[PDB]
Structure formats: C-alpha cells, structure tokens
Amino acid sequence: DQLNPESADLRALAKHLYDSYIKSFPLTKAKARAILTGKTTDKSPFVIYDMNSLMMGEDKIKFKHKEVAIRIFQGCQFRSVEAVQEITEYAKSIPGFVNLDLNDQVTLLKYGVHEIIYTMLASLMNKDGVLISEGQGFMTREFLKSLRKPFGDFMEPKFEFAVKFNALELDDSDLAIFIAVIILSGDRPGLLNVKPIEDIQDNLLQALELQLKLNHPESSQLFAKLLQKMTDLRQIVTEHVQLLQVIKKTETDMSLHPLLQEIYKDL
C-alpha cells in the first residue's frame, strides 16, 4: 500500500464504477438495508407472506407481468429480463468494455448476467425474505417454499448463498467493482480476443483488492473469499438452469421468456 499515481488511478476507477452503479441500479444495497431494518423514512414495503397477502399485494403493487405459483415464476423471469438491461447499461460504463469486439461484449454479458443477478439479489435478502419491485414489496422465504411442486425450490439456493454472502458485509462501493470483475471474465466460452478482456480484468482486480483493504480494515481474508464466491456463483447459475429443466420435464407447457431461452441455450 503506497500513495502513487497507480493507486490514485485505481481509486479513480473505483469511484467511476460506484457512480455508474448508482446510476444504473435503482435500489442500492445501502437503501435496501435501510428498508429491511425499517430505518428508512420511506413507506414500509407491502409484506407477502401467504396466499391472501400475495393477492392483496398484486392489487396494491403495479406488477408488470395463471395460478399463483406460475404467476410468481413468470414475475421472476420478467424481473430477470429487466435486470439484464440494467446490467448491460452498467457494463457500458466499465472503462474499455465498449472497445471490445461487440461479439465479445455480448458473450461476456450472456455468461455474466445471471451471476450478477444473484449477487445483487443478496443485497435485497435477509433470513426472512426478499425485497421486490424496487422495495415496494417483501416476499417471504417460507412463502416461496410453500409454492406447489415443482416450484417451491428454486429460490432456496439463492437465499442460502445470500446469507453467507451478506455475512461478508460488502457495501455498494465494494460491489460495484466486484460485479465489474465478474463481467470481464476471460474464460467465458467462445470469446474472440481473450487478452484485452484479461487486461481489463486484471486492472479491476487490482482496484478491488485496494478497495477491500481500505474499506475493511478488520478483514484481511476478504479478497480471497470474494474470489471463492465468484466460483460459487457459477455453480448457482448451473444448478438453476438444471432446476428449470426439471420444471419443464413435468410442466411441459411452461416456456421461458424467449430472451432467457437464448441466454440459457448454450449454457
């Protein structure tokens, strides 16, 4: 750790990513945690904890998307497609990203967006449930587990991931760099020019390590633990696609949103 022009550049990169992240993502972790504790001055979210409150909340909240379990399943797909858009806008602000070959930009987003979705879902989760509709609702973990087979399973691994990930106590300034690192992964299948991606990622990794050393004086293991989480996330994505296939095997009339079908196609 020294104050030299390289470290000043790395702090400027971290600040740029934070400022962009705040612009691209409506509900930050900082705001989400204030809502979850009730410390916000905003109105409380509507809590969905059973079938009755699900129906009352659908009448209260403007959801942009059958029976209950299918409606929730579809609402998650619609949120996912929205999130793809937000993450794409964020990726355009990562220095160097839009100068990569446009096919590599697309490949990096295809293989990275779900890892980012699950990372940022953790910001909205506690032990009891998840904030939905940019904080207007809160849907409980046990209500999700109560949905009829084969729909009662798919959020559980995401809550399990979140409980452990949230224990690391990252803030938005940390997360903005972490999710840039994930997007700039040079080992995604089918990339045309790996070296320029790795060069960007190495710089982001340096910015992340410096940020974590400055921002978390009471951990020295945090960077290594975050590299571990990046591997965990790929397992969560794969397991989710497998879950979706199982659902399709028995609910053959289910269909994924066409954009998710393309992302999952060669995945």
Min separation Cβ 142 and ligand EWR, Å: 16
Site string for ligand EWR, 228-247 (x = CB under 6 A): ------------x-------
Q: Is 72 in the site for ligand EWR (CB under 6 A)?
A: yes
Tell me if 80 is assigned to a ligand binding site: yes
* Angle in degrees, CA 179, 184, 188, rounded to 5: 115
Of 100, 117, 191, 197, the residue at the interface with ligand EWR (CB under 6 A) is 117
* Angle in degrees, CA 62, 63, 69, rounded to 5: 140
Contact yes or no for 199/81 (Cβ under 8 A): no
CA–CA distance, 199 with 201 (Å, rounded to integer): 5
Site string for ligand EWR, 120-159 (x = CB under 6 A): ----x-----x-xx--------------------x-----
Min separation Cβ 152 and ligand EWR, Å: 12
Q: What sign for the dihedral angle of Cα 197, 199, 200, 202?
A: positive
Tell me if 73 is assigned to a ligand binding site: no
Q: How far is CA 234 from the centre of its chain?
A: 12
Contact yes or no for 227/207 (Cβ under 8 A): no
Residues that bind ligand EWR (CB under 6 A): 63, 72-73, 75-77, 79-80, 117, 124, 130, 132-133, 154, 240, 260
